[PDB]
From Swiss-Prot, chain A:
GO terms for molecular function: DNA binding; DNA-directed RNA polymerase activity; zinc ion binding. Present with 907 molecules/cell in log phase SD medium. Component of the RNA polymerase I (Pol I), RNA polymerase II (Pol II) and RNA polymerase III (Pol III) complexes. Component of the RNA polymerase I (Pol I) complex consisting of 14 subunits: RPA135, RPA190, RPC40, RPA14, RPB5, RPO26, RPA43, RPB8, RPA12, RPB10, RPC19, RPC10, RPA49 and RPA34. The complex is composed of a horseshoe-shaped core containing ten subunits (RPA135, RPA190, RPB5, RPO26, RPB8, RPB10, RPC10, RPA12, RPC19 and RPC40) where RPA135 and RPA190 form the DNA-binding cleft. It comes from Saccharomyces cerevisiae (strain ATCC 204508 / S288c). This is DNA-directed RNA polymerases I, II, and III subunit RPABC4. The chain holds residues 25 to 70 of 70 of the full protein.
From Swiss-Prot, chain B:
Component of the RNA polymerase II (Pol II) complex consisting of 12 subunits. DNA-dependent RNA polymerase catalyzes the transcription of DNA into RNA using the four ribonucleoside triphosphates as substrates. Second largest component of RNA polymerases II which synthesizes mRNA precursors and many functional non-coding RNAs. Proposed to contribute to the polymerase catalytic activity and forms the polymerase active center together with the largest subunit. Pol II is the central component of the basal RNA polymerase II transcription machinery. This is DNA-directed RNA polymerase II subunit RPB2. It is found in: Nucleus. The binding of ribonucleoside triphosphate to the RNA polymerase II transcribing complex probably involves a two-step mechanism. The initial binding seems to occur at the entry (E) site and involves a magnesium ion coordinated by three conserved aspartate residues of the two largest RNA Pol II subunits. Signal peptide: none annotated.
């Protein structure tokens, strides 16, 4: 059950927004990664 | 100098990514002594 964001540093699926901060959960680190779609992406191998 | 939760070691990797300014601060040793 889900993903939205990631901790640049302490490596750990976060998931949060607005009035929420922009920090973390078991690293207090202020940099955050978006995190990959599940819509599947295709490549031509050319 | 933070937004909130305050004053922290900064590595160069993070200053780059947060648009920070890899800075340290300056401290003198001051003296009051009286003369007009
Ligand atoms: Zn973290």
């Amino acid at each position: 059950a889900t993903l939205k964001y990631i901790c640049a540093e302490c490596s750990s699926k976060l998931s949060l927004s607005r009035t929420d901060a922009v920090r973390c959960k078991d690293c207090g680190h202020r940099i955050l990664l978006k995190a990959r779609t599940k819509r599947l992406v295709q490549f031509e191998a050319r | 100098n933070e937004s909130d939760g305050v004053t922290h070691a900064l590595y160069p990797q993070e200053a780059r990514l947060r648009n920070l300014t890899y800075s340290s601060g300056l401290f003198v040793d001051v003296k009051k002594r009286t003369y007009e």
